[PDB]
Amino acid sequence: AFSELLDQVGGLGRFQVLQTVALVVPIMWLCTQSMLENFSAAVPSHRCWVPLLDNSTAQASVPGALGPEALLAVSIPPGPNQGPHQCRRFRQPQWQLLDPNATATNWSEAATEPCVDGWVYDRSTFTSTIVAKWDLVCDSQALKPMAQSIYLAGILVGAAVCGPASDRFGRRLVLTWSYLQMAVSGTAAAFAPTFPVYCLFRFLVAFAVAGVMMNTGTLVMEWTSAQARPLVMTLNSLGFSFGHVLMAAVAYGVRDWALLQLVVSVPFFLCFVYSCWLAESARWLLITGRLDRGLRELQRVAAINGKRAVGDTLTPQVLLSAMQEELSVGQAPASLGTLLRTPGLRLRTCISTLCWFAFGFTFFGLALDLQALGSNIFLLQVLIGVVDIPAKIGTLLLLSRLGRRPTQAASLVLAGLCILANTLVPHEMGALRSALAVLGLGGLGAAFTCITIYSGELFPTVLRMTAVGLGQMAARGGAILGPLVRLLGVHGPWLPLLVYGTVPVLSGLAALLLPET
């Protein structure tokens, strides 16, 4: 509402605290939904099915007993990197390779049989997985990143439909609808019998995620005081930061792809239930002509804040007079035609969108394939969640006592360089490998928070929202494009990481040209 009304009702008080907690608690269970891919779509070791071992009759037919290690060679070509071929097998058994004296070079995949009877996955760490369920290996390997991209695509669609809709129906209504949509879509995805059905439900879940994010952010921004809008927006982000730790904790308990999804998505039903008691933003109600509901909402907030006499004295006449400043000046959003046309503003917007896209691309291309960064995924997730908090908190202090531009450049460049170095280190040493990956991810989070604080300040007041929205769209597009880099993994696992580490470095170096403050 207007400053005078929000002051007579109370800037920061009990109701603020309550609504912020209510709206931040779901953010953890939404970061869990976003990061569920790491655990529900893990890729375990997958040898090729062979009748000799799986079928006990053939194995028992041979007199005596033969060790599995020796009997696997006679039916699996020696694959690259001194290991069994994951997608090939021997068409017929070859006892010649059984003798260790003979060199195994002659035994190769020249006359190997492509997997016909299916794959045998390991269940030591994951009882079941999407990859092990729908055989997303070998020829279908590329289908794994695609499912991650489509989900991200949904987010881009959600922000494209939850913007105007929320501006015509409200924030509380769309928030409740998105909560229920997320709950139902996540519950239904657990029972998907085919890959396309699961992908469609994941896309709907992403739609709901975008809706929830935008609506909760807008409600928090509107119901908070002017001097603390970015602060509580960064609190919204810190909720996701702790959702990382929540995801790490939940995965270690349930080892499955359906039970994990169901447990992750079921709390959103309770979210929808209690979401019917939140407060619709009074600002939107007043500017959109809803006066009685706005008055009721303001009185409710004031009573909750402990001021009943102040609310009792409010009248529609004063309510309209307070909002006359906004009613008379009917600010309409400005199109990009008045933004990119000015030559003196092109470089700023270009660099801003470059930074937004670089983060949205590298971060979500790296975090989705968390297995490639380190040794085990649980420790990586826990450390990411633990470290992203202090980095984000310290970024604010750096901004306070240091310029915005140098902090942005340093954070982005250091994150990119750490990601690049993570690839160069020998693969045997996993400790520094995971440490460098964690430091790079924390630096990326710090850079994201810094750019979020920075983007609004460069552009004038009138054009700030257009530039912010353009940056968010660029970040979502980069997120969509991020997983597609892993498609360039057939050449080697190093190329995707090299791309992911080279992009942030160049973006940071470019981010030193835009003016300070």
Ligand X SMILES: O=C(O)CSc1nnc(Br)n1-c1ccc(C2CC2)c2ccccc12
Q: Is 495 exposed, middle or buried (0-12, 13-18, 19+ CB in 10 A)?
A: middle
Listed residue (144, 93, 85, 142) closest to 114, CA to CA: 85
Structure tokens at 92: 């017929």
* Sole binder of ligand X in the list 436, 476, 497, 505 (CB under 6 A): 476
Q: Is residue 365 part of the contact set for ligand X (CB under 6 A)?
A: no
Q: How many residues bind ligand X (CB under 6 A)?
A: 13
**115 vs 367 by CB, closer to ligand X:** 367
Total residue length of the chain = 517
Rounded Cα–Cα distance for residues 195 and 66 (Å): 39
User: Applying CB under 6 A, which part among 61-69, 111-119, 236-244, 325-333 lies near ligand X?
Assistant: 236-244
The full 3-state SS of 424-458, as one line of letters, equals HCCCCCCHHHHHHHHHHHHHHHHHHHHHHHHHHHH
Shortest spacing between CB 33 and ligand X, in angstroms: 9
Residue at shortest CB range from ligand X? 479
* Sole binder of ligand X in the list 125, 141, 236, 502 (CB under 6 A): 236
Shortest spacing between CB 229 and ligand X, in angstroms: 12
* Sole binder of ligand X in the list 360, 374, 442, 508 (CB under 6 A): 360
Q: What is the DSSP letter of 120?
A: E
Which 185-224 positions form the footprint of ligand X (CB under 6 A)?
213, 217
**74 vs 415 by CB, closer to ligand X:** 415
Shortest spacing between CB 441 and ligand X, in angstroms: 10
User: Applying CB under 6 A, which part among 298-306, 342-350, 475-483, 504-512 lies near ligand X?
Assistant: 475-483
Beta carbons of 357 and 156 less than 8 angstroms apart: no
* Sole binder of ligand X in the list 23, 155, 417, 514 (CB under 6 A): 155
Beta carbons of 269 and 417 less than 8 angstroms apart: no
What are the residues whose beta carbons fall under 8 Å from the beta carbon of 22, sequence distance 6 or more?
Answer: 274, 278
* Sole binder of ligand X in the list 16, 32, 187, 237 (CB under 6 A): 237
- Reading phi first (left if > 0) and then psi (alpha if -120 to 50, else beta), residue 45 is in beta
Structure tokens at 258: 């359906």
Which 478-497 positions form the footprint of ligand X (CB under 6 A)?
479
CA distances from 283 to 171, 207, 247, 299 (A): 11, 25, 35, 14
Percent of the chain as helix, strand, coil, to the nearest 5 = 70, 5, 25
Q: Is residue 23 part of the contact set for ligand X (CB under 6 A)?
A: no
**463 vs 475 by CB, closer to ligand X:** 475
**155 vs 377 by CB, closer to ligand X:** 155
What are the residues whose beta carbons fall under 8 Å from the beta carbon of 67, sequence distance 6 or more?
Answer: none
**126 vs 363 by CB, closer to ligand X:** 363
Q: Is residue 174 part of the contact set for ligand X (CB under 6 A)?
A: no
Which 132-151 positions form the footprint of ligand X (CB under 6 A)?
none
Rounded Cα–Cα distance for residues 242 and 489 (Å): 31
Neighbours of 104 (CB within 10 A): 12
DSSP β-ladder status, 88-90 and 112-114: antiparallel
**262 vs 481 by CB, closer to ligand X:** 481
**357 vs 459 by CB, closer to ligand X:** 357
Shortest spacing between CB 236 and ligand X, in angstroms: 4
Q: What is the DSSP letter of 266?
A: T
Q: Is residue 163 part of the contact set for ligand X (CB under 6 A)?
A: no
**222 vs 326 by CB, closer to ligand X:** 222
Q: What is the DSSP letter of 516?
A: P
**71 vs 214 by CB, closer to ligand X:** 214
Binding site for ligand X (CB under 6 A): 34, 155, 213, 217, 236-237, 240, 360, 363-364, 475-476, 479
